[PDB]
Enzyme design. Sequence first.
Site, short mmCIF file in Angstrom:
data_model
loop_
_atom_site.label_atom_id
_atom_site.label_comp_id
_atom_site.label_asym_id
_atom_site.label_seq_id
_atom_site.Cartn_x
_atom_site.Cartn_y
_atom_site.Cartn_z
CG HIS A 1 -0.60 -0.17 2.54
ND1 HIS A 1 -0.09 0.91 3.34
CD2 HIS A 1 -0.31 -1.21 3.06
CE1 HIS A 1 0.18 0.37 4.44
NE2 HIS A 1 -0.18 -0.75 4.48
CG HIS B 1 4.07 5.89 5.16
ND1 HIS B 1 3.94 5.87 6.44
CD2 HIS B 1 2.80 6.45 5.04
CE1 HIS B 1 3.10 6.02 6.95
NE2 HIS B 1 2.09 6.80 5.94
CG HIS C 1 -0.21 8.71 1.87
ND1 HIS C 1 -0.95 7.38 1.99
CD2 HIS C 1 0.27 8.91 3.17
CE1 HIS C 1 -0.99 6.94 3.28
NE2 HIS C 1 -0.02 7.91 3.91
CD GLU D 1 -3.64 9.48 3.61
OE1 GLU D 1 -3.06 9.44 4.78
OE2 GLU D 1 -4.01 8.61 3.08
CG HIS E 1 1.80 10.55 6.74
ND1 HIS E 1 0.68 9.76 6.37
CD2 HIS E 1 1.21 11.72 6.60
CE1 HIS E 1 -0.37 10.40 6.09
NE2 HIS E 1 0.00 11.42 6.27
CB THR F 1 -4.75 8.24 6.89
OG1 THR F 1 -3.54 7.91 6.33
CG2 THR F 1 -4.64 9.61 7.40
N1 LIG Z 1 -0.53 -3.50 7.60
C1 LIG Z 1 0.44 -2.86 8.73
C2 LIG Z 1 1.65 -2.28 8.30
C3 LIG Z 1 1.96 -0.86 8.19
C4 LIG Z 1 2.41 -0.04 9.38
N2 LIG Z 1 2.60 1.38 8.69
C5 LIG Z 1 2.49 0.98 7.48
N3 LIG Z 1 2.41 -0.13 7.36
ZN LIG Z 2 0.36 7.71 6.00
#
Ligand SMILES: NCCc1c[nH]cn1
Ligand SMILES: [Zn+2]
EC number: 4.2.1.1
Length: 257
Positions: free
Chosen positions: A61, A91, A93, A103, A116, A195
Amino acid sequence: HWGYGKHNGPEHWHKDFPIAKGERQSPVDIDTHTAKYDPSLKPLSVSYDQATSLRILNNGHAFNVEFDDSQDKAVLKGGPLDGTYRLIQFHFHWGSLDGQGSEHTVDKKKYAAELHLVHWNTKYGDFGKAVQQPDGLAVLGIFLKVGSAKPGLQKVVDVLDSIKTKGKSADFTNFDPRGLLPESLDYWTYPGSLTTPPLLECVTWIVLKEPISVSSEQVLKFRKLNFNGEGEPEELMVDNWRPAQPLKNRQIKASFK
Ligand SMILES: NCCc1c[nH]cn1
Ligand SMILES: [Zn+2]
Ligand SMILES: [Hg+2]
């Protein structure tokens, strides 16, 4: 399984994570004329000089850069916070086009990405226990606009090729997060949540007013990542952002006038 597409997208998260419709959800729109100056807020303290980055991973993601958080090496304090919060991971977005991707929005304006930096309150001893408390976490959010290249982000860009698909990870040491900070530390603060599921309402949000600039070329490498795992049909990782949630009973505070 949750994601960002039409059948498993933010509009559906509520079926598996009912808190998605709770009282302190995030991202919110920061209305700058309704945000109130708070003189009682202290300047934020970012001590990132002993940061130890360890790995970079594509979790399906977003991509996460992870830090060693077993000692007080990269911490955030002051501002709206009570206590020390240790950096665990950062990370981003982003969107599939430069006009979307953040976001949080400012006066309804969307930026090309949002970074973030996730911290957990060290009174709770580990991250797992901090996500069980109304104040367990502090997230520093920074807007990215497409302009000039951010030299400090290039080390991250050059490594993406090797974590293209879901589940891959790469060693990523000696990365300094200070290279990702804007010049000013002025912010807006409110109580919210993570989020992405599990959407835990554990977070004190610290949203920096000043965005950092990134080149089109840099933002473009992010858009080359994949949501799928190796050997499955290719879905590029783009628009991995959750839409703004209603503010409800919350007051957004500004650290500046
Ligand atoms: N699915 C939990 C993992 C995670 C924490 N932060 C980003 N991704
Ligand atoms: Zn984030
Ligand atoms: Hg919580």
